[PDB]
Amino acid sequence: ITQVRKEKKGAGLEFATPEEALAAHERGEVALNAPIKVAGRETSVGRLKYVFANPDEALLAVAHGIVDLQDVVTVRYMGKRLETSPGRILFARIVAEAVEDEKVAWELIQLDV
Amino acid sequence: QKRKLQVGDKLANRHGNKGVVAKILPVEDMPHLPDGTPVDVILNPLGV
Amino acid sequence: KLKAPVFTVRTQGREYGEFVLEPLERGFGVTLGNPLRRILLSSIPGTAVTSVYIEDVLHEFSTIPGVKEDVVEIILNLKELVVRFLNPSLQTVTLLLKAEGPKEVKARDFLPVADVEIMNPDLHIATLEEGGRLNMEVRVDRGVGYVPAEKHGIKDRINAIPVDAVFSPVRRVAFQVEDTRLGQRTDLDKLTLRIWTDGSVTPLEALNQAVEILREHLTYFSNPQ
Amino acid sequence: SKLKAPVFTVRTQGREYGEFVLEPLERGFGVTLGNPLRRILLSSIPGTAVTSVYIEDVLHEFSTIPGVKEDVVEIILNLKELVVRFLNPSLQTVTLLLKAEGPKEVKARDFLPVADVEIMNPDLHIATLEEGGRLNMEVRVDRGVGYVPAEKHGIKDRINAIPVDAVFSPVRRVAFQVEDTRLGQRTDLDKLTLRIWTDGSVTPLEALNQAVEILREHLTYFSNPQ
Amino acid sequence: FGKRKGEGFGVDKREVEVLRRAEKLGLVTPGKTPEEQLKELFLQGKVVL
Ligand SMILES: [Mg+2]
Ligand SMILES: [Mg+2]
């Protein structure tokens, strides 16, 4: 659940606007987790298409099947805009609830691995 | 005595994979095929 | 939103049935099918052989003169006997079998009993050789689940042999979810339940009992404390 | 030999969390009951959500407004946190108007009051305006169930309106646990604990009652063959 | 699977989801029908469970 999926359908392809990248994903030109560049920043469709306000919303989308635990999306957690997968966010909640301390558990884990 | 399979009994195949029964599940809890046939034994792929 | 789904029933005799519930919202194919499948496979009442008495036989680890099969094999054959009680109030019956060799005694050789029907008369029980005799008193009880002989330990006589009882009349349950569509929305579920039974209880009856069990369990979430 | 009817105990704190225990249960019925309720709780409980937002002088979602710390995405994220309860059953869709001038910390209470519309979290932060910043919003709130991404509904009231993911589900999280329990000589019994998190528009008890009623209604569909 | 077709049953919704993950793991060939992808999994000794 903590490993992130990597795609190669439209890897290395560049667009001009974030809407253009989303349109290409609709036609199947680029995959959800394929590394792309919008203007000059390396991103993916999942980071732009799926921006979740909280871990509960991100996991609700997983429960409804929109995204998998391994898809890289944008989640707002701890007051920070994280480009992570729901599974990595889910792992953070496992540690946070086990120790009953959200801030200390944030300092205990390596989220991006 | 007629001994049935119980938890703690040792099972093995011919390839050296051996283990004791740790859990006996009811039929509705076992993984099943789309046609409804449940499996009989669940083996850990980490033993291979 | 969506109106009442149409319920379609297809039955193949008394042992197989298909039950289609469409259209359904997304996810209610699993939401309905799996709970019914778990209840169908576990908690459907039926009948099973619980004890067997054979004349001149003291335990199940013996052989009978003139009989090819030992008592263990006879009990194994009796565990596959399917008995249908036509009377809902009937809880216990005893089937009498008196056979003399040479014959292949089947389930149809039991003496007739009122409100009792053998669903597999061709079930092979024992092979009698010339000079061999088989006088059995097979007790069939009504119950739920799987009760090993070591638990119930039912013996109507001194030398009666308790038999592991598999009361479930349901052999196999599968449910299928198709991509159905209605109007302009196409994420709807078409649920099809496939039920195989032993014939004593029909798949339609088993489905109704499973629904009632789930409905009764849903009333347990009342009276909060 | 049938088991005695179980006892339904509730442990509800506040209006957003509650634990519900049902015991004793037959073997396997904790899973038999827990999973259907969780699927219904996360997808079928009626609720309200923001489905469209219009902000003056904003063209796309990935832009920013001169005069506010939060960009369009962050405000959209804050709007997805908004919890609103319709007081009229016939009411289906409302639009909430927000006109604030900087320097202000825009909250959910700054929305103009609408008849039979109640903001359940009026302390929710929306945007932080600096001096000279003008903020004009028209947010569209619909009625629905579950989770609908913005692209899969694409609701726009006017031009330049930004569709937003609709968190219709008032239930935020469901976690059910099945524990082995005993009653005398029976040891394979099940103890089911259902824990429900809700946004506060409905009680976790009310969400459970609605989920049970939905499952009960679907069970009546197995009637009138063909 | 051919017995399923005769009985009047197509491809399960649940199987379609698993096939969707299967092509992301490189286990089935993208662009084929669900029946062909299920056969590809079967030739590897794997079924949708
Ligand atoms: Mg989006
Ligand atoms: Mg039987």
UniProtKB/Swiss-Prot annotation, chain A:
Source superkingdom: Bacteria
Function: DNA-dependent RNA polymerase catalyzes the transcription of DNA into RNA using the four ribonucleoside triphosphates as substrates.
Assembly, per entry: The RNAP catalytic core consists of 2 alpha, 1 beta, 1 beta' and 1 omega subunit. When a sigma factor is associated with the core the holoenzyme is formed, which can initiate transcription.
Family that this chain belongs to: Belongs to the RNA polymerase beta' chain family.
The name this protein goes by in its record: DNA-directed RNA polymerase subunit beta'
Span within the parent record: 792 to 904 of 1524
Swiss-Prot record, chain D:
An example Gene Ontology molecular-function term: DNA-directed RNA polymerase activity
Alpha N-terminal domain (alpha-NTD): annotated segments: 1-226
Record has Transcription as a keyword: yes
Catalytic activity: RNA(n) + a ribonucleoside 5'-triphosphate = RNA(n+1) + diphosphate
Entry's EC annotation: 2.7.7.6
GO cellular component, one term: cytoplasm
Keywords for this protein: DNA-directed RNA polymerase, Nucleotidyltransferase, Transcription, Transferase
GO annotation (BP), single: DNA-templated transcription
Record remark: domains: The N-terminal domain is essential for RNAP assembly and basal transcription, whereas the C-terminal domain is involved in interaction with transcriptional regulators and with upstream promoter elements.
Protein purpose: DNA-dependent RNA polymerase catalyzes the transcription of DNA into RNA using the four ribonucleoside triphosphates as substrates.
Quaternary context: Homodimer. The RNAP catalytic core consists of 2 alpha, 1 beta, 1 beta' and 1 omega subunit. When a sigma factor is associated with the core the holoenzyme is formed, which can initiate transcription.
Family that this chain belongs to: Belongs to the RNA polymerase alpha chain family.
Protein name from the UniProt record: DNA-directed RNA polymerase subunit alpha
Lineage, uppermost ranks: Bacteria, Thermotogati, Deinococcota, Deinococci, Thermales
Curated annotation (Swiss-Prot), chain E:
Domain of life according to the entry: Bacteria
Subunit structure: The RNAP catalytic core consists of 2 alpha, 1 beta, 1 beta' and 1 omega subunit. When a sigma factor is associated with the core the holoenzyme is formed, which can initiate transcription.
Protein family per UniProt: Belongs to the RNA polymerase beta chain family.
Record function comment: DNA-dependent RNA polymerase catalyzes the transcription of DNA into RNA using the four ribonucleoside triphosphates as substrates.
Protein name: DNA-directed RNA polymerase subunit beta
Organism: Thermus thermophilus (strain ATCC 27634 / DSM 579 / HB8)
Gene name as annotated: rpoB
